[PDB]
Each structure stands twice: as C-alpha cells, then as structure tokens.
Structure 1
C-alpha cells in the first residue's frame, strides 16, 4: 500500500475523495509542503 498513495486515484471506491487535501492541511506545515505534495502525488502549480 506504499504505492496507493502515489496512485492518483486514491480512494476511488472509498467515497471520501477528499483525504489527500485533508492530509495536506494536517501535515503540510512541518514535513515540507512540496515533499508531502510529491509523496501524495499532487501538484500545487497545476492546481493553481
């Protein structure tokens, strides 16, 4: 399951599609915004 985090379709079946951003808010401040974003597979520049 180390891989499913890098997978972009994280909880595809699980209806809370929202946990990537929840985790981003929870652990962004300490562990590095960019490092946590790359661990979770999402990209701030494309988001903006």
Structure 2
C-alpha cells in the first residue's frame, strides 16, 4: 500500500540500477491488461 505511491513517480527506479522497468512492465502487461491503464499506473506517457 505504501509502494503504490512510487508506482507513477518518474523517479520510481532511481536507486535501483535498471531504469527501464516501467517499459518492461508495459511490454509484458498492458497488451492483455490495457496499455493506457498500465501507462497511467506507471505514470509514463506512450508518446514519451
């Protein structure tokens, strides 16, 4: 419930080395579960 805060923050994978975890989660989730919904959950934009 506390981790839900940094789901959409642009600095989600800041301390963690991997910086493209949001894109990976979009790749394996959102094709089936709604790409716009996963983008909203991760706080990142498709055009970006």
Question: Smaller-chain TM-score range?
Answer: 0.7 to 0.9
Residue 29 of structure 2 aligns to a residue in which SS?
helix
1:7 offset after TM fit, Å?
Answer: 1.0
Q: 1:12 corresponds to which residue?
A: 14
Q: 2:29 corresponds to which residue?
A: 27
Counterpart CA distance in 1 for 2:38 and 2:18 is: 19
Aligned residues: 46
Runs of 4+ in 1 over 3 A off after TM superposition: none
1:30 offset after TM fit, Å?
Answer: 1.2
Q: Structure 2-normalised TM-score?
A: 0.85
